[PDB]
Amino acid sequence: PAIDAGYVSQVIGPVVDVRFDGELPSILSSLEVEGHSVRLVLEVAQHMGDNTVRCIAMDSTDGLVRGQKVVDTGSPIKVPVGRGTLGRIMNVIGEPVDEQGPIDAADIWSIHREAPEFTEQSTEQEILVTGIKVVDLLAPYQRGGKIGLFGGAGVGKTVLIMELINNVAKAHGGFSVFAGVGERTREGNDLYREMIESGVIKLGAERGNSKCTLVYGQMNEPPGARARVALTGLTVAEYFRDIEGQDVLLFVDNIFRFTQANSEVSALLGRIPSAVGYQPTLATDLGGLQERITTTTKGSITSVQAVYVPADDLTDPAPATTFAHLDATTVLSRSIAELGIYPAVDPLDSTSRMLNPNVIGAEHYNVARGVQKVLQDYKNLQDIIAILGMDELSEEDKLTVARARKIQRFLSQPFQVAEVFTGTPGKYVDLADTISGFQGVLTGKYDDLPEMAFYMVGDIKEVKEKADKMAKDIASRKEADNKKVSEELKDIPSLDKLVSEIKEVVIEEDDGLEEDFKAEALSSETVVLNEEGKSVPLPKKN
């Protein structure tokens, strides 16, 4: 009973050394610390060499004493998978963190597995309509593809991932997994409560009719928890792909936080750091996680990952490494966002493998390439326009600057999830309407319309509606002079008649501060522990 129950050798932050006097646990095995305040799971990372394993803590190590009994579980971190996980919130180690009781486990799968083989792969390219103009036009999504949203802290990739949830995850009739990795806990509560409202998550005895399962490793978690919670969400998605055999939607908010968490951990593991500050194993840790997120021949996983860029730096090694793992990379720019254009999608930096005329049709492809040609030509003109003004341009250049400003504003779109703070109701723009409208603005059918008629509208019917309305409001600015409903006898009381209906409050004068406060008696001397573990005052010597 002593063997294969080892003891804590040294504790450095998220990283625990445990010495096992016989038959060491394997790498990736799960170990349980006995006597901690909470459940502390340690995942074995390395064998250090002297009957010592090197572990990663899935919770805080504050409170670990250097002899503590650590129990090997003989297997990796196994999380509950199945249809009974639908509608629940899980953490990194598969525990319910939504207070709905224990999780109905059809199976429990380890969170570490290999990627599917080369024979298992799927080469099928059908488009996924998102109802977003810039996404559907310029970098269209694949229905079994890895999709990345690249952004720089405040450019809108959580709002884009929520709009993609709202548009896609209702028509798509499968199950969803939301793996929240390293994001705000407030946003996880927001998504959970809005999914209970729209009935995607159902509580109580209706729980089996839920469509989404949430796995959360948010930014208050230690680095070991945020480094493995994406693997937990992957395991929940891979059960539905491999065993239920059906389509999954996996949304991962900030897969960068996985890399950042392993970079926090890797400093204390005794590794020589790679470029900018990262672990030497960035590409292989990221690739081992990303190659599990695929569609095989037996099921589909449509993946949407938000990717954070660290200082608006798209050449940082974590974004530059994760660019090669995606089928559609939607890059959000801060300069686009500062012009008020939302979604702040850089149209000359967002790519897809679907922008291919043999896949989307030559009409869509030619419109998209013409839109990109006009935008790139304006980008080449902007250095002249900023200095010499638009008065120095050619008439051909003035035409392409006007058309490119119109197609820059037309790529912006109101979102249904943004209407609670913008106030403008959102529009779902169909793909045929997107192609037709952008073709019309390309050919010069809508040069009659101003620039701001295109800003934050759905499709080209609404450009002409807003262009009639802006022109219409160019006259109507007055005749709110008299004939009011706000003179003194319309339905109005007097002001003192309004004062007496005020519910007077009683101000309590005592702050309620010592209601049930148990003040402990602080000592005016530092009380410490002597050699016998007994509480004594600090001895008066230096």
Binding site: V11, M219, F421, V485, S486, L495, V499, F517, L522
Partner: protein, 523 residues
């Protein structure tokens, strides 16, 4: 030398003991004649192996917890960061010039904790909870940990209550929810502190008009500031009366970098007392960009590998595990809240810095304060195109929400036509209208220091500006015009607007009536 071959040396294989017995009769008398030179051996206590750079290596301390307050025998506290096989690396909350090699380290049995409670309310403490205001020890207080984990998903609810700041720009444009986190990001000397000070003074003004549970108890955490600045701020909070509700934690620029790293966690543990017992807290981390610099100092002195700009790599986790404790709790947890105002100084307006973009992707919004608006005298210099608060929106004052959408739209069009014409020669005379209205409104929103306004006197003041009622006044006398409007309007309508929550159509009628008998100074 294999461990298979070092394991067989536990078994005795000497086959002759002619000097086991020779020294075992002679070892104790030779040890006894050197007892003047033996320091007493150490097992559960600690002895300092080596101290330097504010990190001591401590031999022994066999039963210390990781992350625990240790006490050096000179009375300086420490924190056991990394327990190693041979030593314990402790981090010294103080100057290491008083720690010697061979000093005794005492375990205290408790992870790093500060005094929290009703009795720390009013006091000026250091980064670890000991008072520095000189008025004695912290009484009516209890000890709680500084590295509590933030509440989870199920322990929260969305922010609903509207947390008035007293700044017209903030309460109209960037409104603050009560469990929200709002970054005050700007350059050096752009009025970052002034917004947070105005919020604290306004909570003093509102705490005496609300019934005992809608009161907000502020905490100001001053990290890396000067001590004279903190003394002047305590003088201001005392003479306004705001020190009745404020805790003031200060780890100043002279203090050790562990104390500056730890002081926001100490202040957060003190304000989480008010979050956890159903009350509401306000916490201001002034220059969280200095806590990041102190943590970078600690990490490079611990020889951890530097990452971007030199920062340790867990400098995101430093601020994320700090600001995630600013929450709004659910009704099963009491319903208390904690609103955070992190402050980040920016170099030359570079929002794309490391710590700046870290804290932007933690907080629920931003308040950008520009040097080009601050030099022109537009104070608070709030960048309206960049400032944002999405969690506090549709959770603000309802009358202010009825008025301020027109204000956000009119400042938006003012920004559009100033983005078109930065030189004045081509006047459309409808572009001149939106220029005159924008110049009226940006004179309306700018205000003076250390005098926050109640929300009904801001609602009426921006009601009188987003409508007509001020176009008689030209561009200069608007600061006196709004004071004349606040003065000459009959003060019953402020009581109806406060009590009802929004402008009712009877109140809109009386308000359109009352804004016509106002003697504007521009005439």
């Amino acid at each position: 030398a294999d461990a298979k071959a070092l394991d067989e040396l536990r078994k005795p294989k000497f086959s002759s003991k002619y000097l086991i017995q020779h020294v075992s009769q002679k070892l104790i008398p030779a040890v006894k004649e050197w007892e003047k030179s033996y320091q007493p051996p150490v097992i559960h206590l600690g002895r300092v192996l080596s101290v330097g750079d504010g990190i001591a290596r401590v031999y022994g301390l066999k039963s210390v917890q990781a992350g625990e307050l240790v006490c050096f025998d000179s009375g300086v506290k420490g924190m056991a960061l990394n327990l190693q096989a041979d030593h314990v690396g402790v981090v010294v909350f103080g100057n290491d010039s008083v720690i010697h090699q061979g000093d005794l380290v005492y375990r205290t049995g408790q992870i790093v904790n500060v005094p929290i409670g009703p009795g720390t309310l009013g006091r000026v403490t250091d980064g670890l909870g000991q008072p520095i205001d000189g008025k004695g020890p912290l009484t009516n207080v209890r000890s709680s940990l500084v590295e509590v984990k933030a509440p989870g998903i199920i322990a929260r609810q969305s922010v609903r209550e509207p947390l008035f700041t007293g700044v017209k720009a903030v309460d109209a444009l960037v409104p603050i929810g009560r469990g929200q986190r709002e970054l005050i990001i700007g350059d050096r000397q752009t009025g970052k502190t002034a917004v947070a000070i105005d919020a604290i003074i306004h909570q003093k003004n509102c705490n005496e008009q609300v019934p005992k549970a809608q009161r907000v108890y502020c905490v100001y955490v001053a990290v890396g500031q000067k001590r004279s600045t903190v003394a002047q701020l305590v003088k201001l909070f005392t003479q306004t009366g705001a020190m009745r509700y404020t805790i003031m934690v200060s780890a100043t620029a002279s203090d050790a970098a562990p104390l500056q790293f730890l002081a926001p966690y100490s202040g957060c543990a003190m304000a989480e007392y008010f979050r956890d017992t159903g009350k509401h807290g306000l916490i201001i981390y002034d220059d969280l960009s200095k806590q990041s610099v102190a943590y970078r100092q600690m990490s490079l002195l611990l020889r951890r590998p530097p990452g971007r700009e030199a920062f340790p790599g867990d400098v995101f986790y430093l601020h994320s595990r700090l600001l995630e404790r600013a929450a709004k709790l659910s009704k099963e947890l009491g319903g208390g809240s904690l609103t955070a105002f992190p402050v980040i100084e920016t170099q030359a307006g570079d929002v794309s810095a490391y710590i700046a973009t870290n804290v932007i992707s933690i907080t629920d919004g931003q308040i950008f304060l520009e040097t080009e608006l601050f030099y022109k005298g537009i104070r608070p210099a709030l960048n309206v195109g960049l400032s944002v608060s999405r969690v506090g929106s549709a959770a603000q004052f309802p009358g202010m929400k009825q008025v301020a959408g027109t204000l956000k739209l009119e400042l938006a069009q003012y920004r559009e036509v100033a983005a078109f014409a930065q030189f004045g020669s081509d006047l459309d005379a409808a572009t001149q209208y939106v220029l005159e209205r924008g110049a009226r409104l940006t004179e309306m929103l700018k205000q003076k220091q250390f005098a926050p306004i109640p929300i009904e006197r801001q609602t009426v003041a921006v009601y009188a500006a987003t409508k007509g009622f001020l176009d008689k006044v030209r561009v200069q006398d608007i600061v006196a015009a709004e004071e004349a409007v606040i003065s000459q309007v009959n003060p019953a309508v402020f009581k109806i607007l406060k009590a009802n929550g929004k402008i009712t159509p009877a109140l809109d009628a009386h308000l359109k009536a009352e804004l016509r008998k106002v003697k504007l100074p521009g005439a």
